């Protein structure tokens, strides 16, 4: 089912990334430029999972390279976390999108639960390969992939969670997605940025 038959029997991240370029586990590979796999190494203690590559990631071939990734950089820096010692990835690896007339970018479209279940084999291979001590789930889509489709990120902020069905029983911290911190009132944004730094420190202190 899904991407599972496209996942090779290997923990090498480069072999997995190359294989993900050939994945047809769902329909998202057709309109996307390429598959966006995770960045970082197997020594990483912290795995971070977003929703999906955006417009910038789709053509950069790397995760979190747009404005959201730059805000995440500022949050990681304030939390004293070396990005090079992370493994950063997304719940689904193909960019889902539409264009609006007058647009300045391709608009990110939300992955269905079906596409998240289809791409999960890659996330399982990534966690199996990295064996992280803690997984940071950035946003509702990533959190639900591991904690259940009914999970609410807003109701468990800053909580160290552990679910049994998860490879390696790593600690899980669900937090806001950095793209949510790009817009809104300045005081709401600044308060929300501090909440993200707090959650990143909890994950680093696991
Ligand atoms: S989104 Fe995931 S499951 Fe769907 S085609 Fe891309 S890699 Fe395969």
Author numbering: 2 to 207
Article excerpt on this structure:
UdgX excises uracil from uracil-containing DNA to concurrently form a covalent bond with the resulting AP-DNA. Structurally, UdgX is highly similar to family-4 UDGs (F4-UDGs). However, UdgX is unique in possessing a flexible R-loop (105KRRIH109). Our earlier studies allowed us to propose a reaction mechanism of UdgX, which involves the formation of a covalent bond between H109 of UdgX with the C1′ position of the target deoxyribose sugar concurrently with the uracil excision from this site in DNA.
To evaluate this in more detail, we generated a Q53A mutant wherein the motif A of MsmUdgX was changed to GEAPG to correspond to the motif A of family 4 UDGs. Subsequently, we incorporated the Q53A mutation with the H109S mutant to investigate its role in a surrogate assay of uracil excision (with turnover). The Q53A mutation in the H109S mutant increased its uracil excision activity. Further, the kinetic parameters of uracil excision showed an increase of >2-fold in the Kcat/Km of the double mutant. When compared with the structure of UdgX (wild type), the hydrogen bonding interactions observed between Q53 with N of K97 and O of K110 were lost in H109S/Q53A double mutant due to the absence of Gln side chain in the mutant. This would likely change the positioning of the R-Loop near the active site, leading to an increase in the activity of the H109S/Q53A double mutant, compared to the H109S single mutation. Taken together, these observations suggest that the evolution of Q53 in UdgX (from A53/G53 in family 4 UDGs) disfavours uracil excision activity. Further, as shown by the uracil excision activity of the H109S/Q53A double mutant, the evolution of Q53 (from A or G in family 4 UDGs), appears also to dampen the uracil excision activity. The Q53A mutant supports that UdgX specific evolution of Q53 occurred essentially to stabilize the R-loop conformation.
